[PDB]
Amino acid sequence: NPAFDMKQINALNGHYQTMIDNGDLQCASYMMSRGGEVFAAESLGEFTGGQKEKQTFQLDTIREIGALTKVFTAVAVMQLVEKGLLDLKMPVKLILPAFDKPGFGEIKILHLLTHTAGLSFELDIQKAEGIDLTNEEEWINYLVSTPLEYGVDEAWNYSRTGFVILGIIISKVTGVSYEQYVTKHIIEALGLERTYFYVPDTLKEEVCVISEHECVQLEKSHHPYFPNKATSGLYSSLRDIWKLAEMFRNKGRLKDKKLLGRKTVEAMLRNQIKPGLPFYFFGAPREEGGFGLGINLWPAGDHYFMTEGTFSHLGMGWCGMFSDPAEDFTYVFFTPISEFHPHAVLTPLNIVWAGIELE
Ligand SMILES: C[C@@H]1CCC/C=C/C=C\[C@H](O)C[C@@H](O)C/C=C/C=C/[C@@H](OC(=O)CCC(=O)O)C/C=C\C=C\C(=O)O1
């Protein structure tokens, strides 16, 4: 039915299981679908937050998704454009008057979504003496007192800061907090059953944590240094991340639940970066690739097995979602790990797409 070589599932399971046996992976889980129907899904290993003993990693285990939160923020911004409350070419200074100054006055909402606003990767918590970084009025003022790294449309520079600003813009346009809007108009509207900005207490023991810092953050009521959780901070499960990726592949709809129009998703999924722009990530330059309206179009094509047009997004954790529209294929995974290793996060993509068969 799904037209998938099941020998690659054994290769995928054996790949994750070997890393868990060698000690460079506590747990691992994945979920893949053809035509909107999951045909393979497995969870491996156990986890501990360093203060307990191991408990079984399951397919419905809740875990922080990190940068995947940016995809929720992107959907929320585009929902407000559909309503006529925002425009992508709006200068940020129109919404946040603290941006009406040299440098910041040229930043538009489009720049924030595409990481071309010239912002640094992140803001400083050390130089913020006596500043409440979780307070929105002070975090913005401290931001505009920091010089910009580039001018607008000068380079693709991945920035946690850009999407915190988007979360503030959402808050100022809708009259409610960023977390309230996303919860109402995305989480409950798409029907996500195990997705929370703050896990209820009856579910905290069901959250996969691999460090004490993750246990500490699980009990926290706010982000430790941001006025919102628009760049990171969402807890979710495989099934919910799969639904979000399927919503994009179906161009805004998931059966009876609709989050966006199909023309809006088509805009989100086409390359929005000017040609020739240099790409940077954490100060280090990376290979140039397509990037949409908060959605990554790289890696795809070239020497990768994913078809051109495959959209994706990764998150520190690690986790990721990859959907191939040409193959009607979607793959999401949880690989909880503290350090990054391409053999543990990127290599399984070769194993999965090598199993895709015709039809
Ligand atoms: C291709 C690229 C992913 C490749 C990452 C490679 C790093 C290489 C060497 C490094 O030295 C090893 C890593 O520890 C350094 C990684 C830095 C990335 C941090 C995150 O920032 C976030 O907001 C995470 C949110 C959160 O933690 O709550 C970024 C999250 C996803 C990135 C997506 C993307 O842009 O795709």
Q: How many CA atoms lie within 13 A of 347 on its CB side?
A: 12
Question: Residue holding tokens 């890696």?
Answer: 299
Question: Edge to edge, what strands does the sheet with 311-315 contain?
Answer: 55-56, 37-47, 27-34, 329-334, 319-324, 311-315
Note whether residue 26 is domain-resident. yes
d(CA 105, CA 123): 18
Cα gap 224→160, rounded to integer Å: 14
For residue 1, tell me if it sits in a domain.
no
In short, whether 158's Cβ falls inside 6 Å of ligand 1 is: yes
Query: Helices 136-144 & 160-174, crossing angle to 10 degrees?
Result: 130
Task: Look at the block and give the residue holding tokens 């990171």.
Answer: 232
Cα of 42 to ligand 1 centre, how many Å? 25
Residue 252, ligand 1, Cβ within 6 A: no
Buried b (16+ CB within 10 A) or exposed e, 306-323: beebbbbbbbebbbbbbb
Q: Is residue 287 part of a domain?
A: yes
Length of the chain: 359
Q: At 172, which CATH number?
A: 3.40.710.10
| Cβ contacts of 208 within 8 Å, gap of 6 or more | 27, 47, 57, 61, 62, 63, 334, 336
- Is 228 inside a domain boundary? yes
Residue nearest to atom 6 of ligand 1 (CA): 340
Full residue range of the structural domain in which residue 192 is found: 6-354
Residue 162 beta carbon below 6 angstroms from any ligand 1 atom: no
In the chain, the number of structural domains is 1
Q: Hey, what are 245's tokens?
A: 């990726």
279-281 vs 156-157, strand pairing mode = parallel
- For residue 172, how many other CB atoms are within 10 A of its CB? 12
Burial pattern 109-137, b for ≥16 Cβ within 10 A else e, equals bbbbbbbbbbbbbebeeeeeeeeebeebe
| 39 neighbors 331 (Cβ within 8 angstroms) | no
Mark the breaks in the chain: residue after which each occurs, C to N over 2.5 Å: none
Q: Which atom of ligand 1 is nearest to the CA of 282?
A: 17
Handedness of CA 173, 193, 59, 24 (dihedral sign): positive
Hunting for tokens 């941001």 — which residue is that?
226
Structure resolution, Å: 2.4
From CA 292, how far away is CA 359, in angstroms rounded?
A: 27
Q: Quick one: angle between helices 69-82 and 160-174, nearest 10?
A: 40
Rg of the chain in Å (alpha carbons):
20
359 found inside a domain = no
Q: Is residue 16 part of a domain?
A: yes
Residues ≥6 apart with Cβ < 8 Å to 183: 197
Query: How far does the centroid of ligand 1 lie from the alpha carbon of residue 316, in Å?
Result: 5
Residues 6+ apart with CB under 8 A from 248: 265, 268, 269, 295, 311, 323
For 249, the 3-state DSSP assignment is helix
Fill in the amino acid letter for 237. S
Paired tokens of 68: 């995947």
Closest among 42, 59, 39, 44 to 355, alpha carbons compared: 39
DSSP 175-220: SS-HHHHHIIIIITTTT-SS-BSS--GGGGGGB---SHHHHHHHH-
CA 66–ligand 1 middle distance (angstroms) = 9
Within a domain: residue 23? yes
Q: Is residue 57 part of a domain?
A: yes
